[PDB]
Amino acid sequence: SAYLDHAATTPMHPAAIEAMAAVQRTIGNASSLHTSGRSARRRIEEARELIADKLGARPSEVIFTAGGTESDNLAVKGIYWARRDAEPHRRRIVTTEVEHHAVLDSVNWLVEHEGAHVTWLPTAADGSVSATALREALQSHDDVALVSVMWANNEVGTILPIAEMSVVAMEFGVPMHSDAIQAVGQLPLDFGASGLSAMSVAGHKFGGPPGVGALLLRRDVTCVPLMHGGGQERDIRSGTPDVASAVGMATAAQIAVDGLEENSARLRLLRDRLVEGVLAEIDDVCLNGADDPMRLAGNAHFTFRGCEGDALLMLLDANGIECSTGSPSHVLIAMGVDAASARGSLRLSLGHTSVEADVDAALEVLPGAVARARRAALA
Amino acid sequence: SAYLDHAATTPMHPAAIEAMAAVQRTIGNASSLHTSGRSARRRIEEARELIADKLGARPSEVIFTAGGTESDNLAVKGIYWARRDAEPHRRRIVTTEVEHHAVLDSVNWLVEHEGAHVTWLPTAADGSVSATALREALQSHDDVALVSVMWANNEVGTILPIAEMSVVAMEFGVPMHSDAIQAVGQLPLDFGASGLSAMSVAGHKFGGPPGVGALLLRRDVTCVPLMHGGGQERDIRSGTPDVASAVGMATAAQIAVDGLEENSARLRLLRDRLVEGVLAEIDDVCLNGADDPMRLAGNAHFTFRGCEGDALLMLLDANGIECSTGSAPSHVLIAMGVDAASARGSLRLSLGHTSVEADVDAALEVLPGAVARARRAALAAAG
């Protein structure tokens, strides 16, 4: 298969499979007092430090989770609660319209279930949000519980201005969370140096085990737990510590962040060649999202007029090209593209294992496939 | 080096390690519509089916979680909320005082934060709780949102009468959850045959990978999610499905539950040899928790008068005997009527699928010396 669905998941690094199988062969609960316990404990502590190192955090800032979704729920609901509980006036969530469901659905739920209110930051046709728009919604609202803004979008690849949005949030004394699940090993990540109160990351998105993640959280931000007890993870997130998955995520984190520079460069070329080929050989197609240097290196997103994206995906699949439609995408809606127009969408995404031929394959196959999808949609 | 802490974690089955390795070698998101995706989906759905079969559930009753803590949390909070939100008067949780912390602390947080109320069922000297006591609690309260009683205790080994308690809950139309985390691979569990609205399990306790569990939940019992953004698992629990872990948990479930009868009897003989040994060679000691036939096959739990559990543990460890104090002074012993002073010299020795004769021999050899040192160490620090 030509695999071009890296943004949905990317192949686990062989070395991470190996490091993880080796933990699995030793016995021990990291919570236990005996020799096996203190070993496991020391392995989980080394993984935590390697992770913090590679994300510009301090080891104690890393709260392991069972994936991106968990991490995003914890930040959003946890912090909302902590803030609302201490000052019941503070009920407003400021967030973007282009968030992953993991955030949006968390937000909508706090709204329906927890008396939350939400202000949606306006979105550019880019798919971006700006530091100013944040300042404007912060100044005109005295009831901001928290802020959540994603670092890079997972459908259209737009990088957001987090660093400078963070300094804004700091200014108003408002904790800011960012979903950086698409960022690890794709752009430079420095938790400490960003202003962030909280940051989400997900193993499998950079060659880690699936079912493991982290929330980076600052020592002084209160967060009400979603999982009780008794707080194996800084009293924020209970459950028996999963050492094998932490170790897996660490090895991954290390390969992926050390290779950040070289790999970005390699994927930009591959992706630009793909974007170029696509627009050269196909009529009525456009790129969505931002241009360099405000886009993920590995991401290509199109709309093909007069197509169903589902038809398209199935025809490409039949020919050995594996990709995704991305989702009527709330993210394209947010960028002011229209319902009809938008159903013709396709995300093609590359990662550590992509090669020239994967691009040669997509370009070979695509025109035949878009023709067929258009024929079919014409009835 | 004798491992006697199987109740905290049991060694992963090597076939479960292999199956999991194999999955992580293939690429695919189970929610993806292309070929690799459909393969991932086909793999997770088979694991699910294997798990259902082995636990007497229908496939769609199985919801994958990140472990037993997640599973207990989802059941207790999520069903509470589903009940409270439908009839704001049902705010009461009926539970036992012996529950694992993942239930106690969930119950507590609901009390502190979500307006819950709690009635604690009375606990016998045994560690045990009865169907009658549940009856009286449901007759005498008209506001109960949810019942949660664990199938077997993780400290003292006691098995509770879930089938007959489940029936009582059914008669007052109140959903019941049971933490069965200790029961899988040690007891014949059949979600179908029990009346349970819900039941929790954790892979690592019967030899599956860490950070994977399941909640078994009836098709008609509503449950508010704790993880949103998906919800990939019947809309109850979001997250990209973890295919490797679930296949692992399945490979383990089929070994654990097929070996059930054989393993059970084998551990009984070991445990019993272990308990008899201890009581012969040591003074002022007792066994805690119910007797056969209401006790897990691999669980031995003792109190030694005149010890700190910690010094005793460190001594045993120094001599290659690895075990636990159980907690957390144990809330379980407190609830069985054991006083906090007496409580303090407690020790859980727990057998599992890799347990061999030599393990019990090692414990029997080292124990008298250990106990005697712990007693002397306790007197001299009071001195």
UniProtKB/Swiss-Prot annotation, chain B:
UniProt entry tagged with the keyword Cell inner membrane: no
Family matches, as Pfam families: Aminotran_5 (PF00266)
Entry-linked InterPro entries: Aminotrans_V_dom, Cysteine_dSase, PyrdxlP-dep_Trfase, PyrdxlP-dep_Trfase_major, PyrdxlP-dep_Trfase_small
Keywords: Aminotransferase, Iron, Iron-sulfur, Metal-binding, Pyridoxal phosphate, Transferase
Domain of life: Bacteria
Positions of modified residues (N6-(pyridoxal phosphate)lysine): 205
GO molecular function: cysteine desulfurase activity; iron-sulfur cluster binding; metal ion binding; transaminase activity
Cofactor section: pyridoxal 5'-phosphate
First-tier enzyme category under EC: transferase
The keyword Transcription is annotated on this UniProt entry: no
Residues the record lists as binding pyridoxal 5'-phosphate: 68-69, 154, 182, 202-204, 240
The protein's Enzyme Commission number: 2.8.1.7
Catalytic activity: (sulfur carrier)-H + L-cysteine = (sulfur carrier)-SH + L-alanine
Family: Belongs to the class-V pyridoxal-phosphate-dependent aminotransferase family. NifS/IscS subfamily.
Annotated function: Catalyzes the removal of elemental sulfur from cysteine to produce alanine.
Oligomeric form and interacting partners: Homodimer.
Name of this chain's protein: Iscs-like cysteine desulfurase
Organism, scientific name: Mycobacterium tuberculosis (strain CDC 1551 / Oshkosh)
